[PDB]
Design a protein around this ligand. Structure first.
Ligand code: PLP
Ligand code: PLP
Ligand code: CL
Lengths: 450, 449
């Protein structure tokens, strides 16, 4: 089969995620066929540096023989069995042990799911079931943040703060509120980062008092916002949030679907900011994306009420704990740990990216460059003195994104914010190539718009 | 070791649909390997898996070809997203094969990871569709009591399980529930034919109660699975089609259990001559070997979404996962090349029915019903009246546990026993299933008397 054959069949039969179906059918889908290391290859023979590690998830890179062998061995032994029938299997047991041993203190149980979205559905039912069992059935409201992403189920979309998602397929799940996001560059340059972080934390208290603490069940947040644009909050934000949560009896849900398993230099983003969440949804890097699996790490406070008071929890998925997916996730975690990959993002690749990434701040159209661990972002501006954006209709970010791909680099755009999330095993020479290709695309972007 | 597995499992693993405390006290079963239609546990027991994992292992365990399909794709392209104006060969070929097997005018698929996520996709698609048609208040979805449509918030809301609705709500707004075509439990004051038409007429009443302008879709399993393997009277679906012909509402056929051979067709919709607008799928799509699901989308809905909708802000990281798709594709190729669906319809289905019917003369079996390789038995305390054992006696759970003790997985929904074995089960294995069931039925009857 030739590229156009794939494209024609794909156009005829395949509806892609988050896609303008009509536009893509007219321009023709890219066809990705194989990958190795940090590189992907398409049906036209192009080799591209995958600066997004698939979709924030291929932490150990492509071509890890050990993950292939883990799946093959489990498929030959027990490809599938359910965890419904008063049953478990060895992969589930061992993965839950390993996961909870890596989790922060007081987080000792896991409920398995297939995706980060199903994990957030699990979170929502667990949170509201929890308060019902506490004798407080009016404690129902969940506070998220604008521009947050918590998945694409109805619950995940409702918990998220994406207006274009909210505008499609609603009504949403009831009882979700949204406060402002700690995005200094886009929304806070009228203040010092420190003052802005405290304002955005105070917004949580304001929302609590607006709804009434007796009606609020939980606050949900990504430690660092991923899909919304790799937005690291000011250093003042999370300490001030902890101050607010200490005043009110509310659960903390840290959505670790992107930040988990090395991305920011820790096993969990919660650990980078010293949080103690009651629940933590996870997926993506859990298995380096090699097979689908997610879950909720459940803190002792929620777990004990559900166990001791709840009887049966009428919740779960056919593929919860899927033994082949669990076998792969277990091996992925063992490799991440045995090879010191997390320590290495934090002490080696993270700082190295930071210095190489910071060499882009002097580019004519880069208004800000930020990174943490192996997550990074650039802010494209038309005027550096004022920070003014290029006009929205010009699509500066999408143009830079397409020019990056044309130069051999996957670097995505959220509006006029460029983002990267490369595999955690990326080599220093490969980071060098990434920044060079980025600068080339930035050069070509600036020339075309001026 | 078994007790070592159990202690670690108790400490850290919260199971689906489980009384966490009770199971921790009793000790989890530990399943460790499987081949053919049999599973094995950490104590060395071989058990005939009359439920095919969870209604999903259609080609049975030990299929070398599915293992090789997974290994080859993991070595080629283990994962890549379909978000970035991108696709990959497995998604392309799987979408082609799937739509070629689907009913007429069902030519597109949106991939998901699970049947639950597929029903979330259904719900957003249905409501986005009518919004694009200029009817944004045409939002109500009519499901059925005792329906099962998954365990997301959307799936739980779409389902009709009161114990689920009672945990973690509020539900998604705008879902109504009409009565189920369960003749044995709820219709024995009528002929099956009249009952089937009454249950169809309940749909019309609900439409008129809500107002056709507010109703978006009717969602139903062709045959209810988790609710107790409830085949409707033969009058039901023809009468439902008459109602659907009169009103402008979408039909969603939830094929997560009925898809891919279970009833003797590629889709339960095809057994009943339905023309659905959307069909969520999962489970048998891959014989459960790897997680994957999706929504088969009819031309009516697809063209509106494509031509009017712009971007659909919906999807999952693992939508179209190329390793899972590669396995699903091979599963379909094997099911077709080996004539498994045809064999359910013409051989194993009819054979189960005759052997299954040999259980009707048992002292506590009030009804035996089957279709393809789905079957159910109704436990009763008195065959004259059909009355149940008191719920407090747990007749169904006792029979379930006695089946397992005899080497057979046969599930209980209240006092309804259900089976859904792999589609590659052989005739003598169907005999063994019925023989082992009878042993458990004898022992249940003795223990309850
Ligand atoms: C990816 C994303 C999700 C959704 O995960 P899926 O596997 O796509 O369902 C949830 N939370 C966050 C923070 C995410 O980035
Ligand atoms: C299994 C089931 C679902 C849910 O599928 P999951 O993969 O468990 O999320 C949906 N619909 C029906 C009819 C089912 O039996
Ligand atoms: Cl509000």
């Amino acid at each position: 089969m030739q590229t156009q054959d794939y494209q024609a069949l794909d156009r005829a039969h395949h509806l892609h995620p988050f896609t303008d179906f009509k536009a893509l059918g007219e321009e023709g889908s890219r066809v990705v066929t194989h990958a190795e290391g940090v590189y992907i290859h398409d049906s036209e023979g192009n080799r591209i540096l995958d600066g997004m590690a698939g979709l924030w998830c291929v932490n150990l890179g492509y071509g890890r023989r050990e993950l292939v062998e883990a799946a093959t061995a489990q498929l030959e032994q027990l490809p599938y069995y359910n965890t419904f029938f008063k049953t478990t299997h060895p992969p589930a047991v061992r993965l839950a042990e390993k996961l909870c041993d890596l989790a922060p203190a007081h987080i000792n149980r896991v409920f398995f799911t297939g995706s980060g979205s199903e994990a957030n559905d699990t979170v929502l039912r667990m949170v509201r079931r929890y308060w019902a069992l506490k004798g407080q059935p009016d404690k129902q409201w969940i506070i998220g943040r604008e521009n947050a992403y918590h998945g694409s189920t109805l619950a995940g979309m409702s918990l998220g703060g994406m207006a274009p998602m909210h505008a499609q397929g609603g009504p949403c799940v009831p009882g979700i509120a949204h406060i402002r996001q700690p995005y200094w560059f886009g929304e806070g340059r009228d203040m010092s980062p420190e003052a802005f972080g405290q304002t955005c934390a105070e917004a949580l208290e304001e929302k609590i008092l607006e709804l009434g603490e007796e009606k609020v069940a939980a606050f949900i947040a990504e430690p660092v916002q991923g899909a919304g644009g790799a937005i690291m909050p000011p250093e003042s934000y999370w300490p001030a949030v902890k101050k607010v949560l200490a005043k009110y009896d509310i659960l903390l849900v840290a959505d670790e679907v992107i930040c988990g398993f090395g991305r920011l230099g820790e096993w969990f983003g919660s650990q980078h900011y010293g949080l103690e969440p009651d629940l933590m949804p996870i997926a993506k890097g859990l298995s380096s994306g090699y097979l689908p699996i997610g879950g909720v790490l459940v803190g002792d406070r929620v777990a004990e009420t559900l166990i001791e008071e709840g009887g049966e929890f009428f919740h779960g998925f056919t593929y919860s704990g899927h033994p082949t997916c669990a076998a792969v996730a277990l091996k992925n975690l063992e490799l991440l740990e045995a090879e010191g990959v997390v320590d290495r993002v934090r002490d080696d690749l993270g700082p190295y990216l930071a210095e190489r990434w910071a060499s882009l701040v002097d580019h004519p159209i880069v208004g800000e460059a930020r990174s943490l661990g192996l997550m990074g972002a650039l802010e494209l501006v038309a005027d550096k003195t004022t920070g003014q954006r290029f006009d929205k209709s010009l699509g500066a970010g999408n143009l830079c994104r397409d020019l990056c791909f044309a130069n051999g680099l996957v670097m995505r755009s959220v509006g006029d914010t460029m983002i990267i999330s490369p595999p955690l095993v990326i080599r220093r020479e490969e980071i060098d190539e990434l920044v060079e290709l980025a600068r080339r695309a930035l050069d070509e972007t600036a020339r075309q718009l001026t």
